[PDB]
Amino acid sequence: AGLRKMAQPSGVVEKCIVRVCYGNMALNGLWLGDTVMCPRHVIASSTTSTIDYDYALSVLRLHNFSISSGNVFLGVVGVTMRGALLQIKVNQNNVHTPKYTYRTVRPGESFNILACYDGAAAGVYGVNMRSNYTIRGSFINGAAGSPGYNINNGTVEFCYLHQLELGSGCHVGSDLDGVMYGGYEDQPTLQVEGASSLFTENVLAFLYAALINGSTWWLSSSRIAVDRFNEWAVHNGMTTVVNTDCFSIFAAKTGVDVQRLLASIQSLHKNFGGKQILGYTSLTDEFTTGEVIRQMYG
């Protein structure tokens, strides 16, 4: 019983974190094989006006890099631009490189953040990609290059490298191809995140988890069809429900159908009435069906 936002174990990623310093800038990189990936703004000499990164890379002084894993310093062999990232060839292979892939995550999907400072992991926590391609993270200035990851069957799937903060607690990264999530720019110029919508299919997973955990005071006796719900959602900051049959195993083990929870969502949208659901006072969309299944049944 219980439900917690948790992370997968971090040990396999921790040995890939390096410190990347250039000039007055210091952040983290990801050392896989004989390459270090880090945000390209480590070579930026400014913080206020639009940066010509190609110029910056042209005048780059390779020996002015300090890349270290613990107290082991890595020699830089060459540097190339990879979108919003620098791909740095170093002179040593990371012999603890895990089996890994890259994958760009989609809104609604969960992953793990290994928060890093000075090239060392400091904390690990689960996040969920919001509709406006930001995450609700906890990062301060030294944290760029912190990786996001999932672990599937001993393979590490890297999906995120931390880049910037947009608003209070509002964080943006790039995938490992160097494509910034949401199209935000790694420039110090005015940018605002777009409106966010609660991911409804995650809200459903949260409510099914609440049922499995015995929390039922909010369950509607009434029901509402997906369409009637989908028209209400676009006026009330929630995404539309497209398909319901991934909740079949949830419906089968609680006896409660989606349409009944859709009605609870409506009445819970702006009112828990002073009660709680699994400790929560507002609806949350940070749990996916997949996470719930694993925590309720393994």
Partner: peptide, 5 residues
Amino acid sequence: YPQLQ
């Protein structure tokens, strides 16, 4: 705002 971290 964009704060490069």
